[PDB]
């Protein structure tokens, strides 16, 4: 077809500028979070160190300890699972709470809120940012509120936001990768802005497709990236959908009515730690330091052991390196007088490296969770000491549970607002099985 | 492919491969039996009804850990490294213990390797004066390799399920700490238990 | 046009299966390595040949199997039955039906 | 965390009745439980007094 396009550059720049600054301002934080996640995923060696170890013949061995602490924190959060509840401010409002406590609960069982909360907590432990979308979905009885989980690498926010729930954030959005056929089926009007994206980006791989190497997007399975962004305009919150080539949905007011009857951003995001540069990081960062000392000192102590240092007399008619390699072998031989070869001592180096490795292991074990909440500790200690260490670790983990609680409360509030916005009388009767709940239909 | 990985048919049987595929297009879920030759079952809407009354994929699957590259793995990957280190250090200590390093004077009319093999045997002999052959010390290497192996054993013990949860004391505690250690192990395995519970719930709903 | 549609659908299905198989090659290889390691196959062919040439027997000390068995036994001891609960009291009997069905 | 609101309600009834501070009649208690023979128990408890 003709498809007259390429209207102007100003419109495209104004459309993609917010995503551009979101990508640019959080490059270091995203790289650090990706490194922490890779450390959690049994990837604690760089390419250069692995190449050097392969060159020297030493295998690369990783003693992963971050995963144990992250699993302990996640299990602690799982064991403290709670249910949504509405409490009446005054006795005459009691029945009103008895409505909401039901309705919200239904949503938390319709969307499997437990699993989404669990993965949100996992990302909070690892990357320090959780994003939950409170939207709508089609059901048999009508439209129902729906809870969706946004991956840390598929969600961008206002870099200038300082609060941990993003009260002051000007905008936030989600990147979604969709097949071209599905995109055309879902939005046939915006066929002129859906452009193939086959080339992978190496400078910024955070918002690309999860499988980096995909040799099927040429013609077989074409994939595109679409950004859904909600931004606080002077009039109010506005929602838009766009791509790198244009606007899928032109800037329009947000369709999700908020708590106070005004359009609101459905995305609820929480963070664990914020630095002086507004970079958000999780607890895994604290374990990044010692973990390397667990690995590197492991390698060096192994290198000092399978190799020997020898001084060779110049009268020897053999290569020094060959003689050293022969003497390093358990069944090696040498032909010569006593003084031709002298083995220098290197046991002190290995012993010192082993002691430093043990010290680093103790430090990481005490670091973060006290290692007793995971039932590991250090041994040779009484039960009362174990309980005291577990209580101390639980106290040190109060902020994590507080973040989870705040995210849950925000999600429940958005769920109640969406229920008031979209539920009808028939849905109220079908779900709650109470006639009086028809009083609660709509916001008036 | 076929599990036995033999496929002799010298013929014994005839094995064929089919693929069931459930795929969600723009309008809904479809199911198809196919091989590379053709369609055993033509693409049709899925004959299984979901929660919402629409066709849905009957397969319910779960995974333990997901990598940044959409890679899925279990708990064995953590213990892969320590097990390799244990085996390698064990083999190195075995090689070091049963072998000796000898420096042989150039005035010996025998092969150096043969002399080393003779001196490595418990009942070996050598002919010559005092300075003909010298035995280099290698016990430090074996002892330190054994220490590294013990450290790797401790690491692999502390890596997976708790030893106290697994029935191993390793320290002979007072018994009260055993209950707390088991509670910690349960906390660690809570993620795995939740995965199993979610899979069971999905299966029951289907 | 039935033949063309069937050919296109078959090509799409085969392509989908091939893409799924190819994109997970490293993950499948790692999972197979872990499974073999659990099944006493913790030594490579080259290292086994080197040990055989050296005359040193290949000895395997397996500790992964113990942890896997402990986890499986824990999961077995925390077995639970399916259960249906009613959202409202009037649904009570209905839930019972599911409890008698599933 | 409770599977249903009725389960938490029954647990609260247990907590109130165990102390013995307030008198909780057994009919409402059974109505709030999750027993399969609940209609039979309710009918047996709510049956009218004997003509004697």
């Amino acid at each position: 077809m003709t498809s007259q396009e390429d209207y102007t550059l100003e419109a495209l720049t104004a459309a993609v500028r917010r995503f551009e600054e979101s990508e640019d301002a959080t490059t270091e934080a995203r790289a650090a979070a990706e490194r922490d996640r890779d450390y959690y995923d049994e990837k604690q060696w760089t390419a250069a160190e692995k190449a050097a170890l392969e060159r020297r013949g030493q295998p690369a061995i990783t003693f992963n300890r971050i995963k144990r602490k992250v699993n302990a924190l996640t299990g602690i959060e799982k064991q403290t699972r709670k249910d949504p509840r509405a409490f009446p401010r005054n006795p005459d409002d009691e029945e009103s709470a008895q409505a909401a406590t039901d309705a919200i609960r239904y949503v938390c069982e319709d969307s499997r809120w437990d699993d989404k909360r669990s993965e949100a907590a996992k990302e909070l432990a690892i990357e320090g940012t959780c994003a939950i979308m409170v939207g709508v979905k089609q059901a048999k009885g009508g439209i129902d509120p729906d809870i969706r989980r946004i991956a840390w690498d598929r969600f961008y926010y206002d870099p200038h936001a300082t609060a941990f729930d993003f009260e002051d954030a000007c905008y936030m959005g989600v990147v979604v990768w969709m097949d071209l056929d599905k995109a055309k089926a879902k939005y046939p009007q915006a066929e002129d802005v859906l452009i193939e994206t086959w080339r992978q980006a190496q400078q910024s791989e955070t918002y690309d497709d999860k499988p980096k190497h995909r040799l099927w997007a040429d013609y077989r399975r074409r994939r595109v990236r679409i950004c859904e962004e909600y931004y606080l305009d002077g009039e109010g919150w506005k929602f838009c959908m766009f791509t790198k080539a244009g606007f899928i949905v032109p800037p329009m007011p947000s369709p999700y009515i908020g708590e106070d009857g005004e359009p609101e951003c459905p995305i609820k995001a929480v963070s664990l730690y914020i630095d002086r540069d507004n970079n958000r990081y999780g607890e895994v960062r604290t374990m990044i330091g010692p973990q390397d000392e667990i690995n590197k000192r492991r390698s060096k102590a192994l290198h000092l052991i399978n190799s020997r240092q020898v001084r060779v007399s110049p009268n020897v008619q053999m290569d020094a390196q060959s003689v050293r390699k022969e003497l390093s072998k358990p069944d090696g031989v040498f032909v010569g007088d006593s003084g031709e070869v002298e083995i220098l001592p290197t046991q002190d180096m290995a012993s010192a490296n082993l002691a430093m490795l043990q010290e680093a292991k103790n430090e990481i074990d005490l670091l973060g969770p006290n290692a007793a909440l995971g039932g590991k500790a250090e041994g040779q200690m009484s039960g009362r000491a174990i309980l005291a260490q577990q209580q101390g670790g639980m106290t040190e983990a109060a902020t994590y549970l507080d973040r989870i609680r705040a995210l849950s409360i925000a999600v429940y509030r958005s769920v109640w607002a969406r229920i008031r916005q979209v539920w009808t009388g028939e849905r109220w009767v079908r779900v709650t099985d109470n006639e009086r709940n028809l009083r609660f239909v709509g916001l008036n | 492919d076929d599990k036995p990985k033999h496929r002799l048919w010298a013929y014994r049987r005839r094995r064929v491969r089919i693929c069931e595929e459930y795929y969600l297009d723009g309008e809904g879920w479809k199911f198809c039996m196919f091989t590379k030759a053709g369609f055993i079952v033509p693409p049709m809407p899925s004959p299984y009804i979901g929660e919402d009354g629409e066709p849905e994929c009957p397969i319910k699957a779960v995974s333990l850990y997901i990598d940044r590259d959409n890679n899925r793995y279990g708990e064995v990957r953590t213990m892969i490294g320590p097990q390799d280190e244990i085996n390698k250090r064990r083999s190195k200590a075995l090689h070091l213990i049963n072998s000796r390093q000898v420096r042989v004077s150039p005035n010996v009319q025998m092969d150096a390797q043969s002399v080393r093999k003779e001196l490595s045997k418990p009942d070996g002999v050598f002919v010559g004066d005092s300075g003909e052959v010298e035995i280099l010390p290698t016990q430090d290497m074996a002892s330190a390799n054994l220490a590294m192996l013990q450290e790797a054993k401790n690491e692999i013990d502390l890596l997976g399920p708790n030893a106290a949860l697994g029935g191993k004391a390793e320290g002979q505690m007072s018994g009260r700490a055993i209950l707390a250690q088991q509670q910690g192990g349960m906390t660690e395995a809570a993620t795995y238990l939740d995965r199993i519970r979610a899979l069971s719930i999905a299966v029951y709903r289907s | 046009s039935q033949e063309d549609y069937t050919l296109e659908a078959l090509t799409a299905a085969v392509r989908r299966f091939e893409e799924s198989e190819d994109a997970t090659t490293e993950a499948r290889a790692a999972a197979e390595r872990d499974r073999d390691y659990y099944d006493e196959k913790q030594w490579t062919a080259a290292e086994k040949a080197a040990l055989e040439r050296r005359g040193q027997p290949a000895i395997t000390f397996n500790r992964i199997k113990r942890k896997v068995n402990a986890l499986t036994g824990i999961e077995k001891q925390t077995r639970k039955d399916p259960r249906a609960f009613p959202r409202n009291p009037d649904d009570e009997e209905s839930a019972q039906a599911a409890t008698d069905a599933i | 965390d409770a599977p249903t609101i009725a389960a938490e309600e029954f647990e609260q009834l247990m907590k109130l009745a165990s102390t013995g501070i307030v008198p909780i009649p057994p009919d409402v208690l059974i109505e709030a439980s999750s027993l399969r023979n609940k209609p039979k128990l309710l009918e047996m408890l709510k049956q009218g007094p004997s003509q004697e």
């Binding site: 239904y106 048999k140 009885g141 | 929660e51 719930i201 709903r205 | 399916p82 959202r87 599911a98 | -």
Partner: peptide, 15 residues
Amino acid sequence: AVAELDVDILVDEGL
């Protein structure tokens, strides 16, 4: 319907 999932029936694990 009469008994749909998450509307009238909640599926969980019991003893």
